[PDB]
Amino acid sequence: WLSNEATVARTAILNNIGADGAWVSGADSGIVVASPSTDNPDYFYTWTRDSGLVLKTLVDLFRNGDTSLLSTIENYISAQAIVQGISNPSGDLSSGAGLGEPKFNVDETAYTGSWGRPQRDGPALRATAMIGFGQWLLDNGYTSTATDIVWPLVRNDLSYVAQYWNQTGYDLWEEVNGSSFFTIAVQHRALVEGSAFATAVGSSCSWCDSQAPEILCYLQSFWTGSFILANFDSSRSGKDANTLLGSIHTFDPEAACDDSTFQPCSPRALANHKEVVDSFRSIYTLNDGLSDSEAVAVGRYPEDTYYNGNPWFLCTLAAAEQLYDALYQWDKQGSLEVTDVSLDFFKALYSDAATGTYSSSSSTYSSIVDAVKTFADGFVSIVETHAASNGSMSEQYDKSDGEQLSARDLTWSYAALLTANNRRNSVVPASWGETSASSVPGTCAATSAIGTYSSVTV
Ligand SMILES: *[C@@H]1O[C@H](CO)[C@@H](O[C@@H]2O[C@H](CO)[C@@H](O[C@@H]3O[C@H](CO[C@H]4O[C@H](CO)[C@@H](O)[C@H](O[C@H]5O[C@H](CO)[C@@H](O)[C@H](O)[C@@H]5O)[C@@H]4O)[C@@H](O)[C@H](O[C@H]4O[C@H](CO)[C@@H](O)[C@H](O)[C@@H]4O[C@H]4O[C@H](CO)[C@@H](O)[C@H](O)[C@@H]4O[C@H]4O[C@H](CO)[C@@H](O)[C@H](O)[C@@H]4O)[C@@H]3O)[C@H](O)[C@H]2NC(C)=O)[C@H](O)[C@H]1NC(C)=O
Ligand SMILES: *[C@@H]1O[C@H](CO)[C@@H](O[C@@H]2O[C@H](CO)[C@@H](O[C@@H]3O[C@H](CO)[C@@H](O)[C@H](O[C@H]4O[C@H](CO)[C@@H](O)[C@H](O)[C@@H]4O)[C@@H]3O)[C@H](O)[C@H]2NC(C)=O)[C@H](O)[C@H]1NC(C)=O
Ligand SMILES: *[C@H]1O[C@H](CO)[C@@H](O)[C@H](O)[C@@H]1O
Ligand SMILES: *[C@H]1O[C@H](CO)[C@@H](O)[C@H](O)[C@@H]1O
Ligand SMILES: *[C@H]1O[C@H](CO)[C@@H](O)[C@H](O)[C@@H]1O
Ligand SMILES: *[C@H]1O[C@H](CO)[C@@H](O)[C@H](O)[C@@H]1O
Ligand SMILES: *[C@H]1O[C@H](CO)[C@@H](O)[C@H](O)[C@@H]1O
Ligand SMILES: *[C@H]1O[C@H](CO)[C@@H](O)[C@H](O)[C@@H]1O
Ligand SMILES: *[C@H]1O[C@H](CO)[C@@H](O)[C@H](O)[C@@H]1O
C-alpha cells in the first residue's frame, strides 16, 4: 500500500501547487495551497510553514533522483521572492517583521483578517527548504543561481531568525502565544545549515554563528525530565505532536543519539515518544482494546477541541517517522542503548528490556529493532486503514470511527506520507551539521543579532 500511496502523494501535492495544479486554479506559480477546500474549512491559502515543509520534501526527492520536480522548485523560489516582500499585518520586509506572517492569499496578496500572527517557525522552514536547493545548484555548476538568487532569499530568513528567535509568537497549531519547542528546534537547525550555505556561496553569516548556540541553549529548557514540553507557558500537559515533528524535522542522519538536539534515537526523544503517543490511548474510541505495545491513532495534543479533537494523519505519520529515523541511526552506529530515561519506551515494546548497550551484531538488539519496526509499521497501517480507497488524505480522521474530516487533500498529509515512507526505506535527507552544533553553552543569554533584509527580484 505504501508504494502505491506514495505515488498518489506525489501527484496530489503537485495538484495543490499553482499555477497549474489541477485542484488549485487561481493560485500563483510556485504557491503551495494547504488544501483545495474553500469552505468548511477554508484552507485555500498559502502558509509559509506548510509550503516550506512540502518543498523540503520535494527538494529531498529531487536530490535523490526525481529530477522532473525541477520547475516546481524553481517556481517556489520565484514565488518566495515575491512573498517575502508583501507588506502584511505582521510587518514589512525592511524591518524583517513581515517574514513572520503565517499565511497569504494564493494570489500573492496579504491576508488582512485577524490571525495568530506572527509564527516565527516560517522563515526557518523556508530557509531550510531553499538551502537544500542551493546545495544542489552549487554541486551541479549553477553557481550564479545559488549565489545571486537563492542565497539572498535565504539571507532574509536567516536574518529574521537571528533577530527574532527570542521573542514570543504563535505555535505551529496557530493557537498558543508563547515560545514553542518545534519553532525553537527548527530555528536552531536553520541557522546552522544557513551559515554553512553562506560560506559555500563565498559569503558569511555572523548573526547565524552567534545566535545558533544561544537558541540551542534555550532549547534545553523544553526537557521536563520525562518528556518534551510543547510550549512556554501553557497549563496544558505539554504533550504534543509538536515535539515529534521537532525531532523528525531536525533529524540529521550523521548524528548520534544526541539529547541536546533531541535526535530521534536520543533517550529524551524516545521517552517523549511514549508520553505523547500514550496521551491518545484512552481518549479516542478508535484506539479501544489496543495494548501499550501496539500503535494507536495519534492526534495533536490530548486537550485539542478542534473538530472535537481528533487523530491527524500527519501526527500519526510523525510517530512512525521518528521510529524509522531511530532505526536508521541505531544501524549506522552499530548499537542501541537503553537508559533510565528511555527504559519505559523500550519496556512497553520488549518486556525484557534493561539498561545497557547492545551491539547491532547482538541478540538483544535484534529483538528490540524488530519490535520497534513492527510498532512504527503499526502507525502507518492505521493511516492506510483511514486513507480513501483512491489514496486521498484529509487533515484528520475521526476519533470514534476513523472517517475523514476537516480539510480534504491536505498537502502536508501527503508530504508526511512521502517522508515517513522514505525513512522506512532508509532514504534520508542531507546532513545539516548537527555533529558540530550540539554543544550547549554553559550559560544561556536572552539575546538577538542583526542581519540584513533586502528584496530579491527574479
Ligand atoms: C478521490 O476521490 C475523491 C471523491 O471524488 C476526490 O475528492 C473530490 O475532489 C473534488 C475535486 O475534483 C472535489 O470537488 C470540489 O467540491 C467542492 C465542494 O465540496 C463540498 O461538497 C461536496 C459535495 O457534497 C463534498 O463531497 C465535499 O466534502 C469534502 O470536503 C470537505 C471539506 O474539505 C471535507 O470535510 C469532506 O470530508 C470531503 O472531503 C465538500 O463539502 C467545490 O466547491 C469545488 O468546486 C470548485 O473547484 C472546481 C475544480 O476543482 C471548479 O470546477 C469549481 O468552479 C470550483 O472552483 C473554485 O474553487 C477552486 C478551489 O477549490 C478554485 O481553484 C477555483 O478557481 C474556484 O475558486 C473560486 O471560488 C472560490 C469559492 O467557491 C473562491 O474561494 C476563489 O477565490 C475563486 O473565486 C469542487 O467541485 C470534491 O469535493 C472531493 N470530494 C471529496 C469526497 O473529498 C479526490 O480528489 C480523489 N483523490 C485522488 C487522490 O484522486
Ligand atoms: C529568551 O531566551 C532566554 C534565555 O535562553 C530564555 O530564558 C529562559 O527561559 C526558560 C523558560 O522560561 C527558563 O527556564 C525556566 O526556569 C524557571 C525558573 O527556575 C522554571 O520555573 C521553569 O520550569 C518550567 O519548565 C521546566 C523545564 O525546563 C519544567 O520542568 C517545569 O515544570 C516548568 O514548566 C523553567 O525551567 C530559563 O531559566 C530562562 N533562562 C534565563 C537565562 O533566563 C527566555 O525564555 C527566552 N524567551 C523567549 C520568548 O524566547
Ligand atoms: C554535537 O556537536 C558538538 C559540537 O558542537 C559535539 O561536540 C558533539 O559530540 C556532537 O557531535
Ligand atoms: C561547545 O560549543 C559551544 C559553542 O558552539 C560552547 O558554548 C560550549 O561551551 C562548547 O565549547
Ligand atoms: C544579546 O546578548 C549578547 C551577549 O551575550 C550580545 O552579543 C547581543 O548583542 C545581544 O545584546
Ligand atoms: C535583538 O535584541 C537585542 C537585545 O537583547 C538587541 O541588542 C539587538 O540589537 C536586537 O535588536
Ligand atoms: C539587497 O539585496 C537584494 C538581493 O540581492 C537586491 O535586490 C536589493 O537591491 C538590495 O541590494
Ligand atoms: C522584495 O520586496 C519588494 C517591495 O515589496 C518587491 O517589490 C519585490 O518584488 C520583492 O518582493
Ligand atoms: C528586485 O529588483 C527590482 C528592480 O527591478 C526592485 O524593484 C525590487 O524591489 C527588488 O529589489
XYZ file of C-alpha atoms and ligand atoms in Angstrom:
679
model
C 0.000 0.000 0.000
C 2.830 2.426 0.890
C 4.377 2.197 -2.593
C 1.071 2.966 -4.369
C 0.106 5.581 -1.784
C 3.427 7.387 -2.259
C 2.557 7.502 -5.959
C -0.745 9.240 -5.194
C 1.026 11.505 -2.663
C 3.484 12.982 -5.187
C 0.807 13.831 -7.744
C -1.651 15.076 -5.085
C 0.957 17.575 -3.843
C 1.539 18.889 -7.376
C -2.268 19.155 -7.774
C -2.105 21.612 -4.841
C 0.658 23.815 -6.255
C -0.024 26.783 -8.585
C -0.281 27.812 -11.287
C -1.280 24.564 -12.998
C -2.113 22.181 -10.124
C -5.497 20.653 -11.033
C -7.111 21.367 -7.663
C -5.937 24.978 -7.215
C -6.763 27.163 -10.246
C -6.313 30.776 -9.103
C -3.115 30.036 -7.169
C 0.036 31.803 -8.459
C 3.084 29.948 -9.847
C 5.089 28.275 -7.089
C 2.349 28.793 -4.493
C 1.596 25.743 -2.325
C -2.046 25.765 -1.160
C -2.652 23.931 2.126
C -5.823 22.252 0.773
C -8.239 22.905 -2.152
C -11.065 23.290 0.427
C -12.524 26.831 0.259
C -15.304 26.293 2.835
C -15.921 24.152 5.910
C -12.981 24.574 6.376
C -11.451 27.358 4.273
C -7.788 26.297 3.748
C -7.482 27.887 0.304
C -4.432 29.910 1.393
C -0.681 29.511 1.367
C 1.108 29.011 4.698
C 4.836 29.633 4.924
C 5.234 26.571 7.200
C 3.207 24.141 5.040
C 4.883 25.346 1.832
C 8.371 25.066 3.400
C 7.808 21.549 4.759
C 6.311 20.464 1.414
C 9.197 21.987 -0.544
C 11.814 20.379 1.735
C 10.202 17.032 0.887
C 10.185 17.841 -2.839
C 13.790 19.071 -2.767
C 14.824 15.849 -0.997
C 13.021 13.705 -3.629
C 14.544 15.838 -6.425
C 18.054 15.428 -4.949
C 17.569 11.658 -4.696
C 16.900 11.467 -8.442
C 13.346 12.749 -9.066
C 14.682 15.413 -11.435
C 11.349 16.352 -13.079
C 10.462 18.247 -9.876
C 12.917 20.955 -11.035
C 10.372 23.506 -12.374
C 8.150 23.138 -9.272
C 11.124 24.002 -7.033
C 12.230 26.856 -9.311
C 8.646 28.206 -9.283
C 8.569 28.116 -5.451
C 11.834 30.105 -5.344
C 10.343 32.723 -7.709
C 7.133 32.903 -5.644
C 9.024 33.380 -2.392
C 10.961 36.349 -3.814
C 7.538 37.998 -4.224
C 6.027 36.639 -0.958
C 8.902 37.915 1.240
C 8.149 41.467 0.048
C 4.410 41.526 0.728
C 3.729 44.095 3.449
C 1.272 42.371 5.783
C -0.227 42.695 9.324
C 2.957 41.170 10.844
C 5.032 43.946 9.234
C 7.189 44.625 6.165
C 10.428 43.266 4.701
C 12.577 46.279 5.667
C 12.102 45.669 9.411
C 12.026 41.907 8.838
C 8.812 41.513 10.856
C 6.700 40.782 7.754
C 8.524 37.468 7.305
C 6.759 36.125 10.436
C 3.358 36.262 8.715
C 1.722 32.816 8.927
C -0.324 32.808 5.700
C -1.110 34.645 2.475
C -3.782 34.656 -0.188
C -2.951 32.324 -3.096
C -2.668 35.269 -5.499
C 0.304 36.597 -3.501
C -1.619 39.257 -1.543
C -1.682 39.828 2.229
C -4.329 38.062 4.319
C -5.821 41.034 6.160
C -8.071 39.297 8.719
C -7.155 38.694 12.368
C -4.871 35.704 12.938
C -2.445 34.034 15.336
C 0.498 36.075 13.993
C 3.432 36.138 13.923
C 4.561 32.491 13.706
C 8.334 32.543 13.816
C 8.929 28.962 12.506
C 8.038 30.067 8.954
C 11.295 31.804 7.968
C 13.306 28.916 9.448
C 11.354 26.322 7.403
C 11.552 28.341 4.171
C 15.337 28.785 4.618
C 15.714 25.055 5.232
C 13.770 24.258 2.036
C 15.733 26.760 -0.064
C 19.168 25.794 1.284
C 18.743 22.199 0.048
C 18.135 23.507 -3.486
C 21.021 25.970 -3.123
C 23.248 22.995 -2.208
C 22.175 21.079 -5.360
C 22.722 24.162 -7.569
C 26.305 24.548 -6.316
C 27.018 20.825 -6.801
C 25.823 20.926 -10.423
C 27.624 24.089 -11.553
C 24.756 26.570 -11.219
C 26.850 28.940 -9.064
C 25.199 32.165 -10.260
C 21.685 30.902 -9.422
C 22.863 29.774 -5.966
C 24.749 32.998 -5.220
C 22.530 35.701 -6.788
C 19.024 34.279 -6.188
C 18.875 31.521 -3.564
C 21.420 32.984 -1.099
C 19.811 36.482 -0.906
C 16.395 34.847 -0.281
C 17.919 32.666 2.431
C 19.792 35.630 3.921
C 16.496 37.458 4.649
C 15.052 34.468 6.504
C 18.273 33.769 8.457
C 18.360 37.431 9.478
C 14.754 37.052 10.721
C 15.576 34.012 12.887
C 18.725 35.607 14.407
C 16.876 38.860 15.210
C 13.525 37.432 16.425
C 14.108 33.920 17.874
C 13.964 35.159 21.499
C 10.515 36.761 21.033
C 7.120 35.154 21.691
C 4.784 34.206 18.838
C 2.168 31.611 17.988
C 2.932 27.883 17.758
C 2.637 25.684 14.626
C -1.012 24.928 15.514
C -1.574 28.746 15.417
C -3.227 28.689 18.868
C -0.751 29.194 21.710
C 1.069 32.516 22.084
C 4.444 31.934 23.719
C 7.605 30.042 22.849
C 7.312 26.632 21.175
C 9.604 23.588 21.015
C 9.053 22.876 17.298
C 9.750 26.512 16.452
C 12.959 26.757 18.523
C 14.263 23.387 17.207
C 13.795 24.303 13.506
C 15.201 27.805 14.048
C 18.365 26.304 15.567
C 18.694 23.964 12.593
C 18.155 26.787 10.065
C 20.926 28.996 11.483
C 23.421 26.106 11.486
C 22.896 24.910 7.894
C 22.321 28.548 6.832
C 25.809 29.537 7.997
C 27.324 26.612 6.040
C 25.407 27.666 2.913
C 26.685 31.252 3.366
C 30.282 30.006 3.483
C 29.654 27.742 0.441
C 28.464 30.715 -1.672
C 31.579 32.720 -0.724
C 29.745 34.829 1.860
C 29.264 34.638 5.662
C 26.560 34.676 8.352
C 27.948 36.189 11.567
C 24.454 36.516 13.053
C 23.848 32.785 12.369
C 27.066 31.903 14.192
C 26.444 33.982 17.305
C 22.766 33.052 17.675
C 22.762 29.290 16.980
C 24.379 28.234 20.296
C 22.020 30.561 22.215
C 18.970 29.001 20.541
C 20.339 25.548 21.387
C 20.985 26.701 24.965
C 17.349 27.780 25.242
C 16.130 24.546 23.602
C 17.364 22.578 26.645
C 14.657 24.226 28.779
C 11.939 22.252 26.963
C 13.053 18.986 28.598
C 10.869 18.442 31.681
C 12.729 15.373 32.949
C 10.240 12.906 31.458
C 9.083 14.457 28.158
C 9.489 17.462 25.856
C 7.231 20.396 26.792
C 5.414 21.809 23.745
C 5.093 25.476 24.822
C 6.085 28.058 27.431
C 3.733 28.899 29.003
C 0.630 26.719 28.960
C -1.469 24.908 31.552
C -1.934 22.021 29.106
C 0.040 18.825 29.818
C 2.573 19.949 27.218
C 2.424 16.542 25.485
C 2.070 17.441 21.791
C 2.900 16.010 18.347
C 4.716 19.383 18.082
C 7.698 17.640 19.669
C 7.584 14.545 17.405
C 7.631 16.993 14.467
C 10.520 18.959 16.023
C 12.587 15.770 16.253
C 11.890 14.434 12.764
C 12.312 17.796 11.025
C 15.694 18.294 12.716
C 16.861 14.670 12.184
C 20.443 14.525 10.907
C 21.428 11.088 9.555
C 25.044 11.779 10.648
C 24.016 12.400 14.267
C 24.441 10.096 17.236
C 21.587 9.765 19.740
C 22.181 13.345 20.937
C 19.952 14.578 23.753
C 20.962 18.227 23.174
C 19.349 18.288 19.702
C 16.589 15.778 20.583
C 17.544 13.430 17.763
C 15.045 10.625 17.067
C 17.077 7.952 18.937
C 18.122 10.220 21.837
C 16.804 8.981 25.231
C 14.858 12.248 25.594
C 13.013 11.945 22.234
C 12.266 8.244 22.832
C 10.901 8.884 26.323
C 8.859 11.761 24.811
C 7.579 9.477 22.024
C 5.933 7.170 24.581
C 4.440 10.036 26.628
C 2.962 11.748 23.567
C 1.578 8.549 21.950
C 0.179 7.272 25.299
C -1.827 10.505 25.748
C -4.079 9.368 22.874
C -4.729 5.786 24.033
C -7.749 6.376 26.306
C -9.306 9.461 24.706
C -10.126 8.006 21.266
C -12.675 5.175 20.866
C -10.792 4.327 17.660
C -7.999 3.088 19.959
C -10.254 0.891 22.179
C -8.922 -2.585 23.010
C -5.331 -1.904 21.912
C -2.483 -2.650 24.317
C 0.558 -0.460 25.167
C 2.786 -2.454 22.765
C 0.536 -1.597 19.816
C 0.373 1.526 17.657
C -2.610 3.849 18.020
C -4.162 6.813 16.195
C -2.222 9.932 17.178
C -3.625 13.492 17.279
C -2.015 16.869 18.027
C -2.361 17.124 21.827
C -4.815 15.460 24.250
C -6.574 18.762 25.146
C -7.415 19.516 21.448
C -11.025 20.540 20.713
C -10.611 21.419 17.009
C -13.344 19.396 15.282
C -13.890 17.809 18.753
C -10.224 16.751 18.925
C -9.147 14.015 16.530
C -6.288 11.880 15.218
C -4.320 13.638 12.450
C -2.703 11.821 9.512
C 0.491 13.887 9.714
C 0.765 13.321 13.505
C 0.284 9.549 13.205
C 2.920 9.538 10.431
C 5.313 11.574 12.620
C 5.091 8.858 15.315
C 6.136 6.316 12.652
C 8.858 8.561 11.148
C 10.731 9.188 14.430
C 10.978 5.422 14.923
C 12.185 4.822 11.329
C 14.781 7.594 11.975
C 15.888 5.881 15.214
C 16.249 2.554 13.360
C 18.488 4.166 10.747
C 20.707 5.761 13.421
C 20.977 2.591 15.532
C 22.009 0.645 12.395
C 24.538 3.278 11.270
C 26.054 3.347 14.802
C 26.056 -0.437 15.061
C 24.465 -0.272 18.520
C 21.445 0.660 20.628
C 21.264 1.933 24.242
C 18.585 1.527 26.915
C 18.806 4.208 29.644
C 16.789 5.038 32.769
C 15.164 7.883 30.795
C 14.205 5.656 27.824
C 13.521 2.410 29.750
C 9.709 2.795 29.758
C 9.688 3.274 25.973
C 11.686 0.074 25.426
C 9.920 -1.994 28.122
C 6.485 -1.446 26.527
C 7.701 -2.939 23.229
C 10.160 -5.509 24.602
C 9.267 -6.790 28.097
C 12.817 -7.919 28.950
C 14.400 -4.516 28.192
C 17.104 -3.451 30.654
C 19.538 -0.528 30.861
C 22.701 -1.091 28.825
C 24.320 -1.030 25.384
C 23.538 -3.687 22.771
C 25.618 -4.150 19.593
C 23.953 -4.485 16.163
C 25.526 -7.946 15.956
C 23.932 -8.799 19.331
C 20.793 -10.835 20.040
C 19.033 -8.237 22.243
C 19.404 -5.571 19.535
C 17.643 -7.851 17.041
C 14.591 -8.305 19.274
C 14.319 -4.577 20.021
C 14.734 -3.272 16.454
C 12.208 -5.907 15.300
C 9.678 -4.722 17.867
C 10.417 -1.045 17.054
C 9.969 -1.708 13.312
C 6.640 -3.520 13.883
C 5.421 -0.677 16.165
C 6.349 2.003 13.574
C 4.660 -0.065 10.822
C 1.609 -0.184 13.093
C 1.179 3.600 12.840
C 1.446 3.540 9.014
C -1.154 0.715 8.871
C -3.610 2.886 10.830
C -3.049 5.694 8.293
C -3.558 3.174 5.450
C -6.795 1.973 7.055
C -8.229 5.506 7.025
C -6.943 6.953 3.758
C -9.573 6.914 0.975
C -9.625 3.987 -1.474
C -8.079 6.335 -4.104
C -5.375 7.347 -1.591
C -6.834 10.718 -0.546
C -5.872 12.008 2.898
C -7.637 14.808 4.739
C -6.205 16.680 7.729
C -7.995 14.485 10.267
C -9.680 11.143 10.772
C -12.458 10.624 13.290
C -11.707 9.836 16.957
C -14.532 7.233 17.103
C -14.982 5.861 13.550
C -11.867 6.956 11.605
C -13.949 8.754 8.948
C -12.025 11.598 7.273
C -12.843 15.133 8.427
C -11.675 18.760 8.269
C -9.767 19.903 5.138
C -9.707 17.384 2.274
C -6.493 16.533 0.428
C -4.184 18.277 2.880
C -0.829 18.854 1.130
C 1.061 18.403 4.416
C -0.601 14.983 4.930
C 0.840 13.917 1.550
C 4.332 15.240 2.396
C 4.275 13.402 5.753
C 3.455 10.154 3.946
C 6.340 10.597 1.494
C 8.855 11.378 4.253
C 7.663 8.519 6.519
C 7.811 6.050 3.608
C 11.320 7.279 2.654
C 12.774 6.813 6.169
C 11.170 3.372 6.330
C 13.169 2.632 3.152
C 16.337 4.014 4.835
C 16.192 7.037 2.491
C 17.492 10.021 4.466
C 17.937 13.760 3.777
C 21.207 15.717 3.545
C 23.005 16.357 6.830
C 22.593 19.810 8.384
C 25.779 19.950 10.502
C 24.370 18.703 13.816
C 27.658 16.875 14.588
C 29.374 20.246 15.129
C 26.293 22.047 16.514
C 25.204 20.019 19.559
C 27.427 21.747 22.141
C 25.333 23.594 24.765
C 26.811 26.837 26.220
C 27.380 26.857 29.991
C 25.084 29.867 30.397
C 22.152 30.888 28.190
C 21.642 34.500 27.089
C 18.385 36.279 26.278
C 19.666 37.918 23.114
C 19.470 38.625 19.372
C 21.726 39.531 16.441
C 21.010 41.765 13.438
C 21.449 40.588 9.843
C 20.316 42.226 6.608
C 16.983 42.458 4.788
C 16.832 43.069 1.042
C 14.166 42.494 -1.591
C 15.033 39.926 -4.250
C 13.750 40.107 -7.833
C 13.921 37.000 -10.050
C -10.501 10.602 -4.508
O -11.898 10.733 -4.730
C -12.490 11.838 -4.080
C -14.000 11.732 -4.274
O -14.324 12.137 -5.591
C -11.894 13.149 -4.614
O -12.330 14.237 -3.823
C -13.148 15.189 -4.527
O -12.379 16.093 -5.281
C -13.145 17.037 -5.997
C -12.206 17.830 -6.895
O -12.052 17.139 -8.114
C -13.933 17.940 -5.048
O -14.771 18.765 -5.833
C -14.926 20.083 -5.280
O -16.076 20.181 -4.432
C -16.227 21.460 -3.808
C -17.364 21.389 -2.797
O -17.126 20.233 -1.989
C -18.085 20.145 -0.923
O -19.261 19.438 -1.284
C -19.019 18.108 -1.730
C -20.289 17.516 -2.352
O -21.267 17.285 -1.357
C -18.439 17.270 -0.584
O -18.097 15.969 -1.018
C -17.184 17.949 -0.029
O -16.773 17.270 1.140
C -15.334 17.103 1.127
O -14.612 18.256 1.540
C -14.831 18.647 2.888
C -14.179 19.998 3.179
O -12.795 19.992 2.890
C -14.352 17.532 3.818
O -14.550 17.920 5.167
C -15.109 16.237 3.471
O -14.680 15.126 4.228
C -14.957 15.903 1.988
O -13.632 15.519 1.687
C -17.401 19.445 0.250
O -18.172 19.608 1.414
C -16.483 22.517 -4.876
O -16.563 23.806 -4.260
C -15.349 22.501 -5.900
O -15.647 23.387 -6.991
C -14.503 24.227 -7.254
O -13.422 23.559 -7.892
C -13.684 23.011 -9.179
C -12.413 22.357 -9.720
O -11.701 21.700 -8.686
C -14.231 24.079 -10.134
O -14.733 23.452 -11.297
C -15.330 24.925 -9.474
O -15.670 26.017 -10.299
C -14.898 25.437 -8.095
O -13.775 26.274 -8.292
C -13.458 27.186 -7.217
O -12.656 26.631 -6.171
C -11.384 26.112 -6.556
C -10.615 25.626 -5.326
O -11.303 24.582 -4.674
C -10.573 27.157 -7.330
O -9.412 26.573 -7.867
C -11.412 27.783 -8.452
O -10.697 28.788 -9.130
C -12.702 28.349 -7.857
O -12.369 29.325 -6.891
C -13.274 30.450 -6.912
O -14.349 30.304 -5.999
C -13.956 30.118 -4.646
C -15.206 29.939 -3.791
O -16.022 28.923 -4.340
C -13.103 31.289 -4.145
O -12.514 30.932 -2.917
C -11.996 31.683 -5.134
O -11.420 32.927 -4.785
C -12.499 31.725 -6.582
O -13.325 32.855 -6.787
C -15.041 21.086 -6.423
O -16.043 20.637 -7.353
C -14.767 17.094 -4.080
O -15.247 17.892 -3.019
C -13.955 15.957 -3.473
N -14.827 15.061 -2.730
C -14.475 14.555 -1.549
C -15.333 13.449 -1.008
O -13.496 14.953 -0.911
C -10.369 13.109 -4.513
O -9.806 14.228 -5.162
C -9.779 11.820 -5.089
N -8.375 11.771 -4.723
C -7.392 11.489 -5.572
C -6.032 11.298 -4.964
O -7.559 11.385 -6.782
C 14.769 34.193 25.588
O 15.939 33.476 25.956
C 16.125 33.298 27.349
C 17.497 32.666 27.571
O 17.538 31.382 26.972
C 15.003 32.430 27.916
O 15.151 32.361 29.316
C 14.901 31.056 29.856
O 13.522 30.713 29.877
C 13.267 29.412 30.377
C 11.783 29.091 30.201
O 11.017 30.064 30.880
C 13.713 29.339 31.840
O 13.504 28.050 32.385
C 12.525 28.132 33.438
O 13.073 28.477 34.715
C 12.042 28.705 35.682
C 12.653 29.357 36.926
O 13.518 28.421 37.585
C 11.332 27.373 35.968
O 10.264 27.541 36.913
C 10.751 26.789 34.678
O 10.264 25.461 34.943
C 9.353 25.077 33.891
O 9.999 24.340 32.872
C 10.620 23.162 33.357
C 11.506 22.577 32.257
O 12.572 23.467 31.964
C 9.545 22.202 33.886
O 10.137 21.030 34.411
C 8.710 22.911 34.959
O 7.615 22.121 35.371
C 8.196 24.256 34.444
O 7.248 24.049 33.410
C 11.760 26.811 33.518
O 12.689 25.727 33.632
C 15.192 29.691 31.934
O 15.581 29.752 33.284
C 15.470 31.034 31.270
N 16.901 31.307 31.245
C 17.395 32.513 31.522
C 18.889 32.661 31.470
O 16.681 33.477 31.815
C 13.662 33.060 27.546
O 12.595 32.227 27.928
C 13.571 33.355 26.049
N 12.293 33.981 25.745
C 11.647 33.810 24.585
C 10.295 34.443 24.483
O 12.100 33.181 23.623
C 27.208 17.619 18.627
O 28.071 18.703 18.299
C 29.072 19.021 19.270
C 29.883 20.227 18.809
O 29.026 21.326 18.578
C 29.970 17.807 19.520
O 30.987 18.075 20.472
C 29.101 16.640 19.976
O 29.891 15.490 20.169
C 28.004 16.353 18.945
O 28.560 15.846 17.748
C 30.605 23.610 22.675
O 30.410 24.677 21.750
C 29.604 25.770 22.199
C 29.534 26.823 21.094
O 29.088 26.239 19.885
C 30.134 26.363 23.516
O 29.220 27.288 24.065
C 30.377 25.265 24.549
O 30.954 25.821 25.713
C 31.246 24.147 23.958
O 32.537 24.633 23.651
C 22.311 39.815 23.457
O 23.387 39.452 24.322
C 24.601 39.050 23.695
C 25.661 38.846 24.775
O 25.527 37.566 25.352
C 25.098 40.081 22.670
O 26.116 39.503 21.881
C 23.999 40.579 21.733
O 24.447 41.720 21.035
C 22.709 40.922 22.472
O 22.867 42.158 23.136
C 17.808 41.905 19.354
O 17.659 42.166 20.750
C 18.845 42.558 21.445
C 18.541 42.725 22.934
O 18.894 41.543 23.635
C 19.450 43.830 20.839
O 20.698 44.133 21.428
C 19.671 43.662 19.341
O 20.026 44.911 18.784
C 18.442 43.098 18.620
O 17.506 44.135 18.451
C 19.539 43.988 -1.274
O 19.806 42.775 -1.956
C 18.802 42.411 -2.893
C 19.007 40.978 -3.385
O 20.288 40.846 -3.959
C 18.744 43.450 -4.016
O 17.742 43.100 -4.941
C 18.450 44.830 -3.417
O 18.531 45.843 -4.401
C 19.411 45.150 -2.269
O 20.697 45.417 -2.769
C 11.063 42.499 -2.445
O 10.194 43.488 -1.902
C 9.785 44.496 -2.817
C 8.936 45.517 -2.062
O 7.799 44.884 -1.511
C 9.043 43.890 -4.009
O 8.811 44.902 -4.962
C 9.857 42.759 -4.636
O 9.117 42.080 -5.632
C 10.350 41.764 -3.576
O 9.262 41.025 -3.059
C 14.387 43.388 -7.162
O 14.741 44.391 -8.112
C 13.689 45.245 -8.525
C 14.192 46.128 -9.662
O 13.796 45.536 -10.884
C 13.189 46.045 -7.322
O 12.114 46.871 -7.697
C 12.713 45.084 -6.225
O 12.439 45.799 -5.044
C 13.756 44.015 -5.910
O 14.754 44.604 -5.107
